[PDB]
């Protein structure tokens, strides 16, 4: 869809619950960066890309 997927971002998402994280850069679909975590149960959670906790979670995953 050519629209922002995250109308609000969620708090309290833990690394242990995350299966994957998708980072989508700005463009025609959305002028803001969007971060969507897919949890181990299949839930999708929109995350604040600016958040220092979100940056820490993604860098922890890369190790």
């Amino acid at each position: 869809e050519l629209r922002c997927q995250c109308l609000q971002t969620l708090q309290g998402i833990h690394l242990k619950n995350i299966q994957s994280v998708k980072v989508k850069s700005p463009g025609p679909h959305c002028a803001q960066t969007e971060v969507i975590a897919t949890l181990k149960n299949g839930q999708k959670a929109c995350l604040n890309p600016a958040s220092p906790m979100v940056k820490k979670i993604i860098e922890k995953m890369l190790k």
Partner: antibody
Amino acid sequence: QVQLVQSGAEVKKPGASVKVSCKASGYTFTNYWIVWVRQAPGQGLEWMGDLYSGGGYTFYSENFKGRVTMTRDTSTSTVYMELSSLRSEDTAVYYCARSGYDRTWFAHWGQGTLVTVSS
Amino acid sequence: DIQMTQSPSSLSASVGDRVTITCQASQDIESYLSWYQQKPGKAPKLLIYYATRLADGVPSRFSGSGSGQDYTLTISSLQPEDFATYYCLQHGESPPTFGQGTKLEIKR
């Protein structure tokens, strides 16, 4: 400091075409969509179509497909809407607007251009 | 296309009154709904986007609510400068479509 400046009012005869410009300033032109909305008597506001200023997407309303063309010029940060095969009923104010975070909402609007079609 | 029904088509209210304007979509638009104010001879101006978010610079007296097919714009304490026509816009499905507008008149 976002500004959208449109070309001045025009008068045209039936069968002519009109090309309205929308010059953008105060933001990165290629990161947003420009949409065209017309305001004709008894019809409130009507979306005509839109295009992504960075390229790749142009969409037209089925009510105007076949006689509307929208174009973009990155070097002048300008978008144009050309409406062809004009009829007296195309008399209306034509607005351009820039998208917000996406093309679902219109964050900034041009001042409008009144186009009158008359013999 | 999605039909947007705005209610009422016109209303009269006094300064300090709370004003409520509703917008109903013919199908679920998933909160891709925005509200605009238009003064006579002027371009529309954004008030609210994604159903509830207030645009930059817009006074806190404006608020939006709703989901699915039903949305509401509220002005908590009407001011003289709120004289205008108000429109809703959906873009949950293309083409985007507008409500017919609500003309807000001031009693004084």
